[PDB]
Amino acid sequence: KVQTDPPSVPICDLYPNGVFPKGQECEYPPTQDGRTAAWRTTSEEKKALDQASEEIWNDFREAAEAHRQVRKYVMSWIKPGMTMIEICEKLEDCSRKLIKENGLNAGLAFPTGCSLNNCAAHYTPNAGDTTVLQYDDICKIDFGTHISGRIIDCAFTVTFNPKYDTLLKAVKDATNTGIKCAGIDVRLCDVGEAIQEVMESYEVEIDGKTYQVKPIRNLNGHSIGQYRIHAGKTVPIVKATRMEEGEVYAIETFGSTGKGVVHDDMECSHYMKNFDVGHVPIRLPRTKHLLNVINENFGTLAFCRRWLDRLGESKYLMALKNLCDLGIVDPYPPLCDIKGSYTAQFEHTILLRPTCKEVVSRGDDY
Numbered sequence: 039k040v041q042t043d044p045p046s047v048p049i050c051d052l053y054p055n056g057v058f059p060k061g062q063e064c065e066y067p068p069t070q071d072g073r074t075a076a077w078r079t080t081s082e083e084k085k086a087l088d089q090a091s092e093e094i095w096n097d098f099r100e101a102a103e104a105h106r107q108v109r110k111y112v113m114s115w116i117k118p119g120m121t122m123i124e125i126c127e128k129l130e131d132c133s134r135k136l137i138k139e140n141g142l143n144a145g146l147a148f149p150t151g152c153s154l155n156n157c158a159a160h161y162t163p164n165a166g167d168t169t170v171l172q173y174d175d176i177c178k179i180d181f182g183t184h185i186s187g188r189i190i191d192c193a194f195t196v197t198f199n200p201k202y203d204t205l206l207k208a209v210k211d212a213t214n215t216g217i218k219c220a221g222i223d224v225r226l227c228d229v230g231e232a233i234q235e236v237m238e239s240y241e242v243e244i245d246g247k248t249y250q251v252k253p254i255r256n257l258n259g260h261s262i263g264q265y266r267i268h269a270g271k272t273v274p275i276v277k278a279t280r281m282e283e284g285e286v287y288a289i290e291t292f293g294s295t296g297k298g299v300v301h302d303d304m305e306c307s308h309y310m311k312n313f314d315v316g317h318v319p320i321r322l323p324r325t326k327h328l329l330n331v332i333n334e335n336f337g338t339l340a341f342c343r344r345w346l347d348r349l350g351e352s353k354y355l356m357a358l359k360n361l362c363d364l365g366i367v368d369p370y371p372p373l374c375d376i377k378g379s380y381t382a383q384f385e386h387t388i389l390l391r392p393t394c395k396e397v398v399s400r401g402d403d404y
């Protein structure tokens with residue numbers, strides 16, 4: 039079976055034996071002393087420990103192949119003039135088909151972020167949003183896929199005006215540096231310092247104005263757990279805990295021509311159940327129904343209001359506010375730097391395998 043144009047064939051139909059293409063395989067970097075961690079590539083004790091978890095790595099790879107094919111399709115049609123809703127719905131329709139959506143066993147890990155200009159993250163349109171992608175916009179496309187809760191958190195920046203080319207180059211280089219410096223036993227603060235050092239070495243000129251590129255200090259990389267986008271460990275992107283064997287990380291960096299700090303701005307669109315809250319009995323009818331719709335369709339994965347609308351849900355705002363006030367669901371509003379500033383992002387998911395570091399979401403694009 040061969041892939042169609044536009045893509046419509048599920049990834050598990052292109053690889054029916056269940057063996058999915060590997061991502062970029064990398065040798066582990068040497069420790070702070072000077073001694074290499076490379077021995078793992080040939081360690082028979084690590085080879086057995088890596089082959090035992092083959093099913094897990096394989097689930098990540100199916101989700102990363104769906105991610106690669108979706109984003110290549112998006113890059114062929116994403117154009118100024120389209121509404122943000124049209125872009126998100128078209129990407130998500132393709133994503134559901136290629137991942138072969140199946141309740142909580144396979145699907146979309148989180149809503150399609152399409153944050154514009156000074157807004158760096160967590161903007162997706164709610165219904166009625168008339169926002170249109172502009173020729174001069176700097177759009178961060180951040181979407182996720184999953185197979186059995188193995189999440190691919192991977193993102194890129196879209197532009198149509200070549201004036202942002204050096205800002206894009208700075209963020210791509212800083213993300214690639216964070217990826218190279220990652221490895222088993224490496225301290226998280228050292229990955230951050232290396233990212234910042236590369237990012238700040240760039241100066242850019244946009245519309246007659248100049249800036250030294252700044253990392254967004256309150257945004258960061260993070261460990262990923264099963265059905266848990268952020269498993270608790272933080273990979274700073276500026277200058278105590280160490281990366282461990284078997285862990286999975288989202289290595290992301292954000293560069294800004296503003297203050298390099300993000301604040302909560304605009305209306306909220308992204309929501310996600312608190313992973314640590316157990317069962318809470320609810321009598322309020324609309325609130326109880328919405329919590330049941332959330333547990334059924336999303337569980338601990340993130341969602342957006344547009345995804346409640348497509349399920350036939352209506353009059354849920356107060357019920358959603360109640361779940362938020364109770365601490366059962368947390369809101370994740372858009373995170374924006376100062377007005378007039380520009381932000382860019384590049385993100386990859388990496389597997390800290392016993393034998394090698396796998397940049398599972400790597401493609402021929404980024």
Ligand SMILES: CC(C)Oc1ccccc1-c1c(C(N)=O)[nH]c2cc(F)c(Cl)cc12
Pocket residue numbers: 148149159191257258260267268288308309310340341370
């Ligand atoms: C930047 C910060 C506010 O993000 C988080 C903080 C804690 C836990 C999770 C996330 C998060 C991330 C991510 N850290 O990459 N991506 C997300 C997609 C979503 F749809 C939602 Cl609701 C949540 C997340």
Ligand SMILES: [Mn+2]
Pocket residue numbers: 180181191192193385
């Ligand atoms: Mn992301």
Ligand SMILES: [Mn+2]
Pocket residue numbers: 191260288290385
């Ligand atoms: Mn992330």
